[PDB]
Write a protein that binds this ligand. Sequence first.
Ligand code: XBK
Ligand code: HEM
Length: 391
Amino acid sequence: DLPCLNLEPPKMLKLSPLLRALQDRGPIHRVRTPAGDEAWLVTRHAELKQLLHDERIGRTHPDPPSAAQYVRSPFLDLLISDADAESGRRQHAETRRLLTPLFSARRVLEMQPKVEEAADTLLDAFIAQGPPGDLHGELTVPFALTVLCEVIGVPPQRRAELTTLLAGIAKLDDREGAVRAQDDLFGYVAGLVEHKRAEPGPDIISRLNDGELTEDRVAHLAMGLLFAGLDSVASIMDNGVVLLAAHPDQRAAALADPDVMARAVEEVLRTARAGGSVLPPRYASEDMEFGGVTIRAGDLVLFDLGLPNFDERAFTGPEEFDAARTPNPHLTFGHGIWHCIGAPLARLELRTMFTKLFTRLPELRPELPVEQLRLKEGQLSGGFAELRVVW
Ligand SMILES: C[C@@H]1C/C=C/C=C/C=C/C=C/[C@H](O[C@@H]2O[C@H](C)[C@@H](O)[C@H](N)[C@@H]2O)C[C@@H]2O[C@](O)(C[C@@H](O)C/C=C/C=C/C(=O)O1)C[C@H](O)[C@H]2C(=O)O
Ligand code: HEM
């Protein structure tokens, strides 16, 4: 009898009864996943943060095609190899050395004008169209994609076509459709990488080509970035709009002052999804005794960021949306060597759009009561199916 996890959408600002019960009853539990496999679930902020620094947990497994999974995704399968634990950790460290400088404070400051231009253009169009409008499909997804394309070096005309492909690679209910979407996207990206070698621009693909990587790895890094920076930004943005609409005093504080806005963006990150934010699978590379249990070599270890983010051991009043919360040690961008390398751009995108959205549309709010918002099914990182708003 292992507790069995599900894919039900979370409620606003509150862990589900199963997740609250597991967090109350200890820091780590053997569970069953939506795919039907067994896993460890870590439920508290201190212990999760401690596993994020434990080099026994990583993206290697002796036998990747029989490894326990949370959901079945040919995209996530690309992440796991049968390299030994040291060689995997080496691969990963090299990856971080190359991606980390692409988002330096200087480079992020240089990105700002185009992030702000893109938000203006899209918000003009959204507003021209008049209420009600699908915030998700017509604003947050296209803004995150536009920004990402500009930074990575994908031409803007490709935006409609990537929206389709990046949805395709994330299908959970259609293995062949997902493999095919992956082949097509990769074929496009690999063509783009080759173009850029002949004609470099101030963009990530060129910066990665200026180094010692194979064509193949440059393409894989670019494709991973395109998937990592799209629906994540949209999810945090969609939920921040819901939360900020629902908390008028908090919103007013945020818009009144750019330092409350910077704090408010961290509180949106902490509270956007109260559960269900389960990261790509990681595995123990050897047995380890942790949190009163013995994790075995090969066991799946799951990180659901809602759990630590709502842990009352780490946060005073974790169910309260406090736009001024400081400090705010949320784990929404991960930590340690599993830490978001795009976080500086994501934060810029969030401050930029929250500010413009609520400045221009002070009364912006979802049309439906929150409990009637519908989540996309059968899609990795799927977020809302639509987010109709009025103003
Ligand atoms: C080069 C590689 C390639 C990319 C792999 C991407 C994995 C994405 C996982 C998203 C998972 C999750 O998606 C979920 O999938 C379930 C099936 C659904 O039933 C849920 N409805 C939800 O859509 C968690 C999401 O996470 C977020 O979006 C953050 C999420 O990027 C963090 C993952 C970073 C991965 C980096 C990485 O390896 O770089 C916020 C989002 O707020 C969070 C969330 O939605 O709760
Ligand atoms: C607010 C939106 C975002 C959120 C919530 C988020 C969150 C995360 C998290 C939790 C991780 C750790 C994943 C893991 O350990 O499995 C991660 C890693 C990563 N993120 Fe983000 N991210 C966001 C936006 C972005 C953007 C805009 C980019 C790129 C332009 C990006 C690029 C990456 C990459 C390349 C990694 C893997 C880094 C590594 O291999 O260690 N992310 N992100």
